[PDB]
Enzyme design. Structure first.
Site, PDB file in Angstrom:
ATOM      1  CD  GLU A  87      -2.194   0.940  -0.059  1.00  0.00           C
ATOM      2  OE1 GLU A  87      -4.087   0.362   0.088  1.00  0.00           O
ATOM      3  OE2 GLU A  87      -2.132   1.474  -0.635  1.00  0.00           O
ATOM      4  CG  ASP A 129      -3.640  -3.160   2.422  1.00  0.00           C
ATOM      5  OD1 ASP A 129      -3.504  -1.940   1.966  1.00  0.00           O
ATOM      6  OD2 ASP A 129      -4.840  -3.341   2.681  1.00  0.00           O
ATOM      7  CE  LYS A 177     -10.719  -3.808   3.068  1.00  0.00           C
ATOM      8  NZ  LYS A 177     -10.391  -2.632   2.172  1.00  0.00           N
TER       9      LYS A 177
END
Ligand code: H2I
Ligand code: MG
Ligand code: MN
Length: 182
Positions: free
Chosen positions: A66, A94, A120
């Site tokens: 990320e 991430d 998610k």
């Protein structure tokens, strides 16, 4: 959605590197951080959590994905997938955990944690990417109840998020911020 006071909060609360990254992400989808001030804060909070998480374990336990530009992010991902043999994800995660040899998706929500964890899991298709969700209230949830970091590292993310909520509340920004999540 949100006040110029919230813009001021963001620029005071988060370090300039996070703020610059957040402004770039928003402008990349044609949004103005001075207008969508709540989304501005939310993006900064997620970036901060991702970075704090990466400093949570041993030296270079995690690779950060990320916050990188898209070319570099996929360079990192493809390199790890090639090197460790783990499946290529459909979407940028991430972090990558070297210890546990899995990608991590980090979620930060102003809503209930189980709701976001499930959203998610629906977007993710990797079935091997690990999900970890935090809230501003102190709730926390992870795949298979495996929280990856020790308690001291997690408590401290959770405390930072608490602090952000409180400072927002003292400024009368919290309610707007809380309701603004999509
Ligand atoms: O929506 C994303 N980008 C487009 C966009 C950016 C700024 C705007 O103002 C409007 C749209 C996005 C991209 C990502 O690469 C993530 O990686 C991501 C994430 O981890 C999360 O844990 C949660 C959301 C994530 C969301
Ligand atoms: Mg991400
Ligand atoms: Mn994330």
């Amino acid at each position: 959605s949100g006040s110029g006071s919230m813009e001021d909060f963001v620029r005071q609360c988060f370090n300039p590197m996070i703020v610059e990254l957040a402004e770039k992400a928003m402008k990349e989808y044609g949004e103005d951080p001075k207008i969508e001030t709540n989304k501005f804060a939310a993006i900064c909070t997620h970036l901060e959590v991702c970075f704090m998480y990466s400093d949570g374990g041993s030296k270079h336990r995690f690779e950060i994905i990320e916050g990188r530009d898209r070319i570099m992010a996929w360079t990192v991902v493809n390199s790890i997938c090639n090197t460790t043999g783990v499946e290529k994800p459909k979407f940028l995660p991430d972090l990558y955990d070297y210890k546990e040899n899995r990608f991590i998706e980090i979620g930060v929500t102003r809503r209930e944690v189980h709701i976001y964890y499930l959203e998610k899991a629906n977007k993710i298709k990797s079935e091997k990417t690990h999900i970890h969700i935090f809230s501003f209230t102190g709730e926390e949830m992870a795949t298979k109840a495996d929280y990856t970091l020790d308690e001291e590292s997690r408590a401290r993310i959770k405390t930072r998020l608490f602090t952000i909520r409180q400072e927002m509340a003292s400024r009368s920004l919290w309610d707007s911020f809380r309701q603004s999540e999509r």
